[PDB]
Design a binder for this molecule. Structure first.
Ligand SMILES: [Zn+2]
Length: 631
């Protein structure tokens, strides 16, 4: 008495297998049967039902059928490697979201050539259309089987299962055999649309102190259509890994002699310079005097700063002539030293200093990542010294300045937050009243909404946070406007007010883009390595078909460089189409080709990064096109 999803029953005398119920309905359903779900329990198609229960046929159309497909593709990895590399040991071959992997102990690592040979050999094996034969085997026999095959890791997995398990499913793939809970496909004809993807590193028991393993990743789907959809996603996703883009475009690299510290190559530093020189104008137009302050400061200054407990274990320390110093992790006390040089009146405030300050923090090395998490960072840092009456106006100006910068970089989606007084805080409640209300009045005057964050502010004042979404919808905090009414008092900053009363000024720490290393990492992934013209490291490449045009090319290159454009000449003894394909892959916005005709007419043939042929053109008309698009 076997019940089906439609609520009906089919009678069966003598215990019947899942497949046999399928064949009873028809050859067609049988041909489509991958496995069955007896009372919600997934079982192999060859398993018999002896009692009566409710059945549900699982086919390739079910997410459960795709999973079983993925499980059996793992088994095929072992089948192929045991023929190719008979001395390696199979460990585990489980299913994951959208694929599978098999961890394998191999004395030597696996190369891409290994993958290719393995996938090919798998494809050969799947093409035989052989049945997977499940045999429920006693535990002693299973041990005897794997011991004869030299699979020492399978035997350790067997010695893990409790004594409650006295038999286990053995799945035979011709001469290969593997064990698992399953189920698995009844036949390899369901394994058509698979592919191996990456090869990587794993560990026995997932513990880093045991032997390392080769991890063979793969994916599998019901049809090649869905397989290719998955491949496009994987390609489009690697298209936004800044580490991969940094390597492919020769922008930067890190190495163990300086962990978390970036080596900017010429093209990467060109990108940096575009941003820093634009933010330097922001300093200029916002009323900041840019400064530069020492990086190595007496430990005594950091102990007075109010930040000693946060940074005492997060700074590089160094010694000279029996004095102890720290490499600076922040610019603010240096900026207070500048402010302290002169006598200031209330008349003189606000005074604003900006600095692209090279800072270091002794961050844990295991948490470092590309240029997004570093030990050495430069921010578009700045500090405003003002009276507390002026906080609001200063914050409205900064708000307007920050949005224009976000607008300039094509970040249109913003979210603004205010962090409020934390539990462990300093200063009068009345002073936190004035500072918090000043941040609220400022954002109101600018007609913006904001989310409030109870308890999330620094101990020395509230702050406004500027969060931006990038082209794939993920959120980053870029800007900060942090009120500080504590460090100025700690470090002797003061002015004279309306009646000769010496008072400490309020200090505002602020940044618009934050860490430049981080911001460049966000920009690289945001634009998917295809930078706008004003931002590309190499904007124009002037090439030459022949050696005759070489001198004319150099003349063109130096004219554009005098015009302030980032230009590079390609004068190599190389095929010109090869140069075209190579510079196109670098995503260079413009590629001027010079031949006999262009040198004689005084023109330049322009081909854009998209592939639009602009034809021939005067050199002056190309310069005009660049200034129009704000390059
Ligand atoms: Zn600061």
């Amino acid at each position: 008495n076997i019940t089906l999803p439609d609520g009906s029953r089919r009678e069966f005398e003598n215990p019947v297998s899942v497949m046999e119920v399928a064949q009873s309905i028809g050859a067609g359903l049988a041909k489509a049967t991958i496995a069955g779900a007896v009372d919600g329990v997934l079982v192999d198609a060859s398993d018999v039902i002896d009692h009566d229960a409710s059945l549900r046929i699982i086919t390739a159309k079910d997410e459960e059928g795709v999973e079983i497909i993925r499980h059996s593709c793992a088994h095929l990895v072992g089948h192929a490697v045991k023929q190719l590399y008979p001395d390696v040991k199979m460990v585990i071959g489980p299913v994951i979201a959208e694929g599978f992997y098999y961890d394998i102990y191999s004395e030597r690592p696996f190369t891409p050539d290994d993958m290719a040979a393995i996938e090919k050999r798998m494809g050969e094996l799947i093409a035989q259309d052989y049945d997977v034969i499940k045999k429920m085997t006693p535990r002693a026999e299973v041990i005897e089987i794997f011991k004869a095959r030299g699979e020492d890791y399978k035997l350790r997995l067997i010695e893990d299962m409790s004594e409650d398990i006295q038999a286990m499913g053995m799945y035979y793939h011709q001469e290969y055999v593997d064990m698992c809970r399953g189920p698995h496909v009844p036949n390899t004809r369901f394994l058509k649309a698979f592919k191996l993807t990456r090869i990587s590193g794993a560990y026995w028991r997932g513990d880093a102190q045991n032997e390392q393993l080769q991890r063979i990743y793969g994916t599998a789907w019901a049809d090649k259509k869905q397989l290719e959809a998955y491949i496009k996603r994987i390609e489009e996703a690697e298209m936004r890994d800044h580490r991969r883009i940094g390597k492919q475009q020769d922008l930067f690299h890190l190495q163990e002699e300086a962990p978390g510290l970036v080596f900017w190559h010429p093209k990467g530093w060109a990108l940096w310079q575009v941003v820093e020189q634009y933010m330097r104008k922001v300093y200029r137009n916002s009323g900041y005097g840019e400064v530069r302050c020492p990086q190595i400061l007496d430990v005594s200054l950091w102990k007075k700063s109010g930040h000693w407990d946060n940074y005492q274990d997060n700074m590089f320390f160094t010694e000279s002539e029996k004095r102890t110093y720290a490499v600076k992790p922040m610019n603010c006390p240096g900026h207070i030293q500048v402010f302290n040089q002169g006598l200031h009146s209330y008349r003189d405030l606000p005074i604003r200093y900006g600095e692209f300050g090279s800072c270091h923090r002794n961050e844990p090395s295991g948490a470092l990542h590309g240029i997004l998490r570093v030990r050495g960072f430069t921010q578009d840092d700045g500090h405003v010294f003002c009276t507390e009456n002026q906080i609001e106006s200063e914050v409205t100006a900064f708000h307007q300045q920050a949005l224009a910068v976000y607008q300039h970089f094509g970040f249109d989606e913003i979210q603004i937050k205010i962090a409020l007084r934390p539990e462990s805080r300093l200063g009068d409640d009345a002073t936190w009243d004035k500072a918090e209300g000043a941040l609220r009045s400022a954002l109101t005057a600018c007609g913006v909404e904001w989310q409030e964050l109870p308890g999330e502010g620094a101990f020395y004042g509230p702050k406004i946070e500027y969060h931006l979404k990038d082209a794939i919808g993920r959120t980053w905090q870029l800007g900060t406007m942090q009120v500080d009414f504590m460090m100025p008092g700690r470090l002797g900053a003061e002015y004279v007010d309306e009646n000769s009363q010496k008072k400490h000024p309020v200090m505002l720490h602020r940044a618009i883009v934050g860490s430049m290393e981080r911001f460049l990492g966000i920009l690289i992934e945001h634009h998917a390595g295809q930078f706008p013209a004003w931002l590309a490291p190499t904007q124009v490449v002037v090439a030459n078909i022949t050696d005759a045009q070489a001198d004319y090319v150099s003349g063109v290159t130096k004219t554009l460089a005098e015009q302030g454009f980032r230009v590079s000449s390609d004068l190599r003894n190389e095929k010109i189409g090869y140069k075209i394909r190579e510079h196109t892959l670098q995503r260079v916005p413009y590629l001027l080709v010079i031949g006999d005709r262009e040198k004689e007419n005084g023109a330049v043939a322009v081909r854009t990064r998209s592939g639009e042929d602009l034809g021939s053109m005067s050199l002056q008309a190309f310069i005009e096109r660049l200034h129009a698009e704000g390059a």
